[PDB]
Structures are given as structure tokens and as C-alpha cells.
Amino acid sequence: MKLCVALDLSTKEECLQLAKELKNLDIWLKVGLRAYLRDGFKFIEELKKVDDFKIFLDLKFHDIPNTMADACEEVSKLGVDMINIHASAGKIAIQEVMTRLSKFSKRPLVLAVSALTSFDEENFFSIYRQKIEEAVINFSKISYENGLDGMVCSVFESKKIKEHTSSNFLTLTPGIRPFGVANLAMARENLSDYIVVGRPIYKNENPRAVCEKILNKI
Amino acid sequence: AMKLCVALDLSTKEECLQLAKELKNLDIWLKVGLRAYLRDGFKFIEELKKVDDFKIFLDLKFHDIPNTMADACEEVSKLGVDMINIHASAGKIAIQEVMTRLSKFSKRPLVLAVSALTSFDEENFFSIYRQKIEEAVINFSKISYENGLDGMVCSVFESKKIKEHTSSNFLTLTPGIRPFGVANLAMARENLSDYIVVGRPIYKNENPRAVCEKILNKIH
Ligand SMILES: [Cl-]
Ligand SMILES: [Cl-]
């Protein structure tokens, strides 16, 4: 499995400094909504200049099909390696995004957000009238059949997803606490293809040391 | 009275800025979408504001975990936009966190919730929500209203029903209006739209300013 670090430090300067501390490590970096809204595409260029990190631009697009297609096209021009969209955008949005990205010589991987990991059962049901597990399988099938590369999901749902789609349908599991439970052992047993780790790395006294340990443990 | 918002959806930034210039001094709102913001960022909002004192609706439809949506709404609110929108499907906690964060501003923008994207047909929508569109819209409108939002982005055909289920003071913004086409001005007036968004009929017209003036004249 691959390690992705969530670049969630409060300022651009801190995130770049962290990126510099993780040079030459075989890892991915995830850039979120707040960061992109504030610094734009120029921040992505600066990161690429620090090192050849594979970049997951995490914006969770959710709009009408043509708009999502235009959005995915716009960020793909930046050379990012992975992007995500809401499966809840529906089958037509998914089809239009993949049809648009097929125009690139090299496109990024495209994963669908199933159920936001922040939801609890009651609040999720109020919106989707489905249990979290039910929705995730439902969404994963729609995403798999319509051409996406995988899903963003809880480490606890990763095996179920693959069983209802394919062992080759990718799973990215965020919020992993490597040595914490959603730990590295749970990610391994549940077949996560990608793990995203945040605070355990960025708030640690020696971020590089933590990444080193995770990779070796992997 | 009903407010007119023009969708700045021309393909390039030069075209969009030129359109804004053509509409200078008209009492209208301008809507900036996802592709435009991803491509040009905050500087584009700054440049639009230099054209005239237009009220701006930054339409990004945020949908992420609560703290991330709070952070996003905060960042765009610092630009001085006048209205933003978020997905009601993000849930009540996300709605509460966004409003708690925005109460920290001396002047926050209006915050509307997207209910059911107008692009959906019944079958594809049901596949995701397991509720008919109208049912979902009412359900989402209640959650939005009870948790502090200013109103909803909705089909002009659901505007009156949304207010009946929340309150007449809960705002409705109805996009895709074809003023003289049906979702036309008459329908928007009868269904009590607080804001209408018009795209192609204005930006693809040979004389966009003349179309805006004709719309404003019929509204008033
Ligand atoms: Cl292990
Ligand atoms: Cl909820």
C-alpha cells in the first residue's frame, strides 16, 4: 500500500517547509480545499518543484455533470496524480468526467467519495435514507460500473467495497493513526491501497522520522 | 423585489470581465462558478469588483467534512463575496459549523443550500438518495432552515413549496431561468423566487445589456 501525507498545516509556508522535510521519500501528498482556495494552482507548482511527489488534489467536486467535467479538466492540466469527486453527483456526472479526462495523454486517477468519514449513522440516514454500509456499496458499484478508478472510504469498508466490485478497484482510507482502531494493521487486513495520515505526521516533532517508520513498517 | 443574477459562464476570463463591463451600473448580481475559480482564483473576484460594485455569488457548492467546510466558507468570506452555497447533503453538523464560523465575521455573506442539483432526472436521483426529488428537496429545506441557513438553491417549481414548509422569509434562488421562454419570469414571480439566475439568454445574446434591462423592466 501507499502512504499519503495530509498537508494540513495552517499556512502555505508551513506546508512547503514540511514538503521539504519529506524530500525523496516514496510518498504522496494530499492538498485539500482550504489550501487550494487560498493559494490556487501556483501552490501545486511550488510543491512539484520541491520534489516529484505524487499529488492527490482533494477537492470533492459535486455539481452538475458539465461543470464537474470542466473542473476535473482544469485541475488535470496541473499534472496532479489523483483527484476525487462525490459519487452522490450521480452516474451521468461520473460518465462526463471520465469522457472528458480521456482526452488527456495522461490523466490522474479519479476516486469517488462514498460516505464522508465524519458522518455517524443517524445524520447520514437523514440525508441518504440508507445505512452507511449500504450507501457505500451502492455508491461503489455505481462508480465501478461507470469507470472510476476507486473510492475514498473508511478502512472498515475497504474489503466490502472490493468484494462487490473488484480487488483491483482502488481504496483510499483517510485518517489512519499508524501506531494507534484505524491503524496500519487494520489497513493491511482491510486491503487499503492508499492510506492518508495527517496529525501523526505533521504535528510530530520529527515528521520525516514518522514517515520513515511507516514506510519501513509497510 | 425579485433579484437578477447573471451567470458569468463565458469560457475565458477576458470574456467574463468584458461581459461585466457591459453590465456596469445595472442593479444585478453576478455568479462566479467552479471552473472560473479553479482557474483564476481569488484575483478574479478582486478584478470583478474593480469593474463595478456588483453583488457577487461565489457558487462552489462545498461538500466535505464539517471543519473543512467551515474553513472553506471562511476563506471565501474573506474575499468579501455576498453569497455562497453549500450542499445540504453535507448534513446538519456541517451546516451548524459553517454558520458558527461565519458568525465570527462582522458582515458575512448569505449562505444558501443546494438541495437537488437541477441537472438530475428522477431515476438517477433516486439511485443515490432513495427519495423522489421533491421529497428530498423538502427534507433538505427543513434541515437547512432549522440549522441556520438563509435559504435554498432550488427549481423554480419547488420555491413556493419550500417556503410553505419553512417560512416566507427563507430565501429561494432559482437558476436556469429562461425569462421569455417553463421556467420563465412569470413562473419565477408566481412561485416567489427571491433570486433568479439567468445564463445563456444573457451571455450568448448579441446585446447582453439590452436583455438585462428588459428583464429588470419586466420584474419591476
Ligand atoms: Cl501491520
Ligand atoms: Cl443531517
Pick the CATH number of B1-220 from 3.30.420.40, 3.20.20.70, 3.40.50.980, 3.90.550.10: 3.20.20.70
Q: Hey, what's the cell of A132?
A: 452507511
Report resolution in angstroms: 1.8
Binary contact (A33, B76; C-beta < 8 A): no
Counting Cα atoms < 13 Å in the Cβ hemisphere of B152 gives 35
Q: Tell how far CA B33 is from the center of its chain.
A: 10
Contact status, residue A45 vs residue A56, Cβ threshold 8 Å? no
Give me the CATH code for the A1-218 domain, please: 3.20.20.70
Spans of all domains in chain B = 1-220
Alpha carbons A209 and A214: distance in angstroms, whole number: 9
Alpha carbons A80 and A43: distance in angstroms, whole number: 12
What is the nearest CA distance from A75 to chain B, expressed in angstroms? 7
**Chain B residue closest in CA terms to A92:** B124
Alpha carbons B5 and B202: distance in angstroms, whole number: 10
SS3 A192: coil
Task: Kindly report the backbone phi and psi dihedral angles of residue B189, in degrees, each rounded to the nearest multiple of 5, phi listed first.
Answer: -70, -50
Is the four-CA dihedral A87, A90, A91, A97 of positive or negative sign? negative
Question: What pairing do the DSSP bridges indicate for beta strands B83-87 and A109-113?
Answer: unpaired
**Chain A residue closest in CA terms to B85:** A63
Question: What pairing do the DSSP bridges indicate for beta strands A170-173 and B195-198?
Answer: unpaired
Interaxial angle between packed helices B42-51 and B13-22, expressed in degrees from 0 to 180 and rounded to the nearest 10: 20
Kindly report the number of other CB atoms within 10 A of residue A11's CB atom.
Answer: 11
Q: Hey, what's the cell of A131?
A: 445505512
User: DSSP class of residue A8?
Assistant: -
Binary contact (A123, B63; C-beta < 8 A): no
Instruction: Sort residue A74 into left (φ over 0), alpha (ψ -120 to 50) or beta.
Output: alpha
**Given CB atoms, is A103 within the 8 Å cutoff of chain B?**
no
Which of B42, B59, B61, B63 is best to mutate for the A interface (most A CBs within 10 A)? B63
